[PDB]
Design a protein that fits this description.
5 copies of one chain form a homopentamer. Chain A is α+β, with helices and mostly antiparallel strands. Chain A is 34% helix and 29% strand. Chain A has 6 helices and 13 strands. The longest helix of chain A has 30 residues. At the A-B interface, helix 1, strand 1, helix 2, strand 6 and helix 3 of A face strand 4, strand 5, strand 8, helix 4 and helix 5 of B. Bound molecules: the ligand FC(F)c1ncn2c1Cn1ncnc1-c1cc(Br)ccc1-2 (5 copies) and 2-acetamido-2-deoxy-beta-D-glucopyranose (5 copies).
């Protein structure tokens, strides 16, 4: 009772032209698409790209595949996929996507007696995410995903999300395993682009990414915060100890500088100032300013000692407060 | 006496449809799988992936291949593999797996007169291992491996480990050659997932990894441990030696900071604090606190010298004990 | 009403030799080309290459494809592309270009009843950009793109930009997403090369790149500028403070040196001096010269103290002015 | 007189089944193998792998290819290689091997009238070398190479080195161009493995690698050796010079630490101590101990100056001798 | 008038055996080769390899392709290339070469009525260049390129440069765009190798590379040269300034050491001393020796002050001269 399926299958491929879309010159082909994100790959900030794995699925109606038999469905594999017509779907925003040919080309094809078809596939896409690091690291990146027909304009093939925009895109609970980002939600949209080769429908999906702070705090902020405190210890030393206070300010300033250099190594070479850079600059001012106060004090301690002591004692209560006050404004502004 | 085999082989492929699973619409195909891990590839903590090489094997019953002849077995190669039906097995947790086509596509196919089949294959899989580095480096990672049918639901194709769960998975003695991990054992499990395309059976194998400490001790802990001791030498110096004690504390603190920066370079950019980070912070407190004691002592040595000497002498017996006491609690807690 | 298209398509491929160009031995084939840059990939200064993605398009007239039917156009896909003749276009300046085979080979083929053809394609090209970093970072790189026939000389196949040189090349608004470069415009040109295998027409497109400064200012210039100021603080200290002033000059000089080493790490290993290098050298002279002044002052303070004070006080008003004056000339010269 | 060869060639392929080994069910196929190492690729200690290029050659007897003609040999190329049966040879120890398809698939096939065959091939193998870095850098690594049949057990196909074990493996004089290793010789062995799929013969070749020291001496040992000497200069300074001697010991100790961190960067992350690590630790003790002596001396110079001078003067003659004595034992032990 | 070409083409392929070389068993096939280097890729000193792009061309006589028609030449493309016989040329010195399949496989095939053939091709070769860095950076590397037949010995196929050895190899003016090397010229040679599979002719081409100094001067020499001068400033300071002179020598020595470590990072891990290493060692001696002089002076200033001043004053005129004298000998020796 297996040879019956072979006879049914052969009839479908008899005279089936895979170079022609269904309903050619009779109507507009309608494609219903759903996606399941197996795992959201790492996001490369330097390259402005994010890898992703998805079980991309498509559905369309083809009368040429109509058949009648005891079985209402015909599970198949990639062997018959190339023997029929499939949409020339491509990712406009993608850069380099490679398929999975292990163990067998990962493609499932299902056909119903009514002629409805389902051609799912597994993909790995190194899409590009243009990020505006103006509020880095307190930023909410919106990395989009776009795909559509490469040869069939909007007047022939139309892509529409299936079962609404709610269950069209699904993300696995463990799939979202980013180290420096925290996925919040997904949105799906549609648009038309009027290129030189006619209008083309575009299916757009956006993933809302909220960067999870804590790595930079342990890596950049705390060394800078503790670096500033180290300089302020100099104000608790005798003025005549020129050598002692010199080491604090001099060593602290250089240590402040190298942190800025090291911090941007991981960060992309953006041609503007981020929020972290402003914080570093402010920390640089405190340590640098403390050195100026010591230099100024030593320049007048031999002429007006009375004012020299007042400034040094006052600095012990001014600089810590300003740095503390600045942090509250900085953190509150960017955490609200 | 070789042409007889050719005639037998030709009959099997005569009318054999490779697009249809055996026992279609008559029963549920049963697949028995066994694995042999030739070598457990390196584990990339940064990318949360682990390479592995396996001689993946599969077995199933197909009556269409029944034959009678003098030989009870028909060893073959990849040439005939594509001429018949094979399961569309795929690794759900895999990211990028490439086959070995050297010297010849590494595939062995064996057939018995009863119709039983054996289709073994050699694979290299860059699977993903989600790790929770909360107790790093004292962690017991459990990197799983998952695979199953891509097109045939649980109602048609079922995967089961052969000869129980003991000898189903085998690891070579020299295959486990990890540098920073020590494999302890393996476990195999089965589960069903109810996706939008029906239920699918999943074969899950977990490898218990116990990180072997000793690289971080020579790389991070000892420099930190010796860094703390260097600061404590300052307490064995005259109070008036402001410049001498300043270099110890100031240089030590910065050296402590850079170790934290360098240590996390190899570690993944995790947005939380690991056990090692807490140890570094404690070491930072000792060196930083010693500097505060020196600064405080110098602030009062001109007013109450009597108490200044007591604190300095006391510090020689307090700080070493606290650091030593902390280590025992830290090591004992994370080594138990 | 679909079988009619199949009959029309079959007639075109009946006796169509894809090894022979249209109009062989009768005229010269004319090819009209247009380009759309989906995204200008990153520019690797170290490797002198720039990635780019384009929807390269070609057009030519072929009488062998003439047909008459109800439909004036025949949208198709890659399936029929290999069945006909296409130009052997190649990128002379390219190094490694790979096509996009996801989801389906991204190729659109359109045919009109008149015989006109359109064979568009999506490409990713790692072209090479020879850059002259004499005025780095104030440079205007002109990265060209070249392509032409590999087998058909200028006497048989000619490439010409379509619809003039204005709309021939189009760049997406969001496609130009470079981090350290700011695209200004594009130019297209044509030329002939007389190789040993006859004359070949070459289509050349140049992209005008204006480097966007701001990353190096925050990375190299400012640390150098602030490094110089740190040394000048020494002039505001007592002459007898040999140890204090020694740390400033000595530490500053070494910090100046390492910045030069670190700065060139990202920069390509060019065997000549860039504008930034000259700026670093000048900054090195100021810090180094300040150390010499301190050494010279200490060498005479025991013999002629009167002149020692004058030089130290004078230096407080000379070095800052010269460094400030130099910057205006340096920035004005390279920003004009 | 060329058409005669075509007729002879056609007869051989007439009825030749490439899915069946020669002498099936009549005897055991015997394969003679010889190798020529064109170049021993770089050895990646971090990845425990070594690239290699070889003109792997195989020989076997096939009566189905017997022919009679004027020419006793039939040089051919890869075109006919796929039309006949070839062994399913694979490298058990290999990880990722890719063939050379430039300019043409590099395969030479030769056939004699007697039926003897020769199927040579060019390969690039990224084999894995498990190294025991217990005596690093004074180690003699033995990187093996293993290959055998993937589908044919020992009872059907047997691999044997040709013309003995002397000329079976040949290495080019200029092929061995390793930077940090010095090849000494090669050994070839055979063994049987009783897997779950029957016995399989294995051809094993071992390359004796003797690491050539001199890079680490200029990179690690000498900086450590000179670093120790720098500290010992402190003993030639006045005791009251607390600041001067402090810089020597303090700066030296930190410089000693960073060398250990930098040294292991190139070295694999091995979870144990190497010989170099012990040498570094000993050097650390000398510099660290010298600091303790200075601290201890300053702690008693105000109470018992007489003994303070004796220790300082004695240290000038003790520490240099112990460090010198240690080196002779260390170098002699690991160089014998 | 196009169908005539098709008929002529069909006749050539009628009975044309592509597995047999022309003139089999009648004469020795002669192949004339010419090369055009489009661009000399980067030279990786670490991997001892150099990328290169070439329009490799071959020519040979085949009587089987003789034809008579109005056109004396038959331009073609890769479509017909696989239908005929081509030499099995391979690069003996190559490691990994990949062809260019964009937009179409870059292959031009031309045939004349006389039977002469021309099969040009575009290649990218990652050849290996064994370099002897004994005089680094003043070295004249000679990177060779070798190729020949893989299956046809010298008795059947012979490779000879066309039109002499002058115009056989051509390099584009802009193709030579190396950053740290300056190409001077090219040489072409021929040789025979008597392997186990008969004699094989080898075509060898050598490219004379003259390293262009200037990157290392700005990167290594100048920091070392200026580092030495910094130490010599100490001799212009009062002897009793123990702390001041200590910082110069101590800081300078460590800075000298790190430059050696950093310099060799780019350089390959060669197990011997280069010219630059000797220069660094000499610079190390000057800075290290200056420290010894200061230590020795301070050891006797309390016993024989008269000689202490003489040595310090003398050192101001000795060390600068010796370092200056050494440079002239060093530069003159390696620049002649
Ligand atoms: F005219 C050619 F450049 C061309 N070749 C393919 N396309 C185009 C037009 N074009 N311009 C930008 N993006 C496109 C586009 C978008 C979709 Br969706 C499908 C096909 C194309
Ligand atoms: F519905 C589509 F998205 C789809 N295409 C393939 N699959 C699915 C369902 N799906 N969702 C997550 N994982 C799967 C899955 C699991 C196995 Br095992 C086999 C096939 C699929
Ligand atoms: F004579 C051979 F070396 C050769 N083989 C292909 N070409 C050449 C001539 N050549 N030299 C440099 N660049 C070329 C060139 C340019 C175009 Br456009 C198309 C083909 C070629
Ligand atoms: F039983 C399966 F796992 C299996 N599939 C292929 N092989 C095996 C047995 N096996 N286990 C480890 N190594 C092997 C081996 C060795 C040679 Br040589 C040839 C084939 C195999
Ligand atoms: F005998 C086998 F090892 C073998 N297989 C291919 N070759 C050889 C001989 N061999 N040894 C080193 N280099 C070669 C060589 C050189 C040329 Br040119 C062409 C073919 C070969
Ligand atoms: C795109 O085109 C379709 C068909 O004309 C239309 O229904 C839809 O509204 C268009 N979408 C937009 C955003 O204009
Ligand atoms: C999976 O499905 C099979 C068949 O229904 C069943 O026997 C098995 O118990 C199921 N497994 C689980 C974990 O539910
Ligand atoms: C290239 O050749 C064509 C045809 O001869 C000619 O029309 C054109 O002017 C030439 N271009 C140049 C730059 O010489
Ligand atoms: C391997 O098997 C063969 C055939 O039985 C035998 O001759 C040979 O001695 C065996 N080798 C070893 C090492 O046992
Ligand atoms: C190589 O062999 C050919 C043919 O025998 C001969 O003419 C030529 O001189 C040989 N070359 C060398 C270098 O011996």
């Amino acid at each position: 009772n297996i040879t019956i399926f072979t006879r049914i299958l052969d009839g479908l491929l008899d005279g089936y032209d895979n170079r022609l879309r269904p309903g050619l010159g009779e109507r507009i082909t309608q494609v219903r698409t759903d996606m399941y994100v197996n795992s959201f790959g790492p996001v490369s900030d330097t390259e402005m790209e994010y890898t992703i794995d998805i079980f991309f699925a498509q559905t369309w109606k083809d009368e040429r595949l109509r058949f009648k038999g005891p079985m209402q469905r015909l599970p198949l594999n990639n062997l018959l996929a190339s023997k029929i017509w499939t949409p020339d779907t491509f990712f406009h925003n993608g850069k380099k996507s490679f398929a999975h040919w292990m163990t067998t080309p990962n493609r499932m094809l299902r056909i119903w007696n009514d002629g409805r078809v389902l051609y799912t596939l597994r993909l790995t896409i190194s899409a590009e995410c243009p990020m505006d690091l103006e509020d880095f690291p307190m930023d909410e990146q919106n990395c989009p995903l776009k795909f559509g027909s490469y040869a069939y304009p909007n007047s022939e093939v139309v892509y529409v999300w299936t079962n609404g925009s709610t269950k069209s895109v699904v993300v696995a609970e463990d799939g979202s395993r980013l180290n420096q980002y925290h996925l919040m939600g997904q949105t799906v949209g549609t648009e038309n682009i009027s290129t030189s080769t006619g209008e083309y429908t575009i299916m757009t999906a956006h993933f809302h990414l909220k960067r999870k702070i804590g790595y930079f705090v342990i890596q950049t902020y705390l060394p800078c915060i503790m670096t500033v405190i180290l300089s302020q210890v100099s104000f608790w030393l005798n003025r005549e100890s020129v050598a002692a206070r010199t080491v604090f300010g001099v060593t602290t300033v250089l240590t402040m500088t190298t942190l800025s250099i090291s911090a941007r190594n991981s960060l992309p070479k953006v041609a503007y100032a981020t929020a972290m850079d402003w914080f570093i600059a402010v920390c640089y001012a405190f340590v640098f300013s403390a050195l100026l106060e010591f230099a100024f004090v030593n320049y007048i301690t031999k002429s007006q000692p009375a004012r020299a002591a007042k400034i040094d004692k006052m600095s012990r209560i001014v600089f810590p407060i300003l740095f503390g006050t600045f942090n509250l404004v900085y953190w509150a502004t960017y955490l609200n």
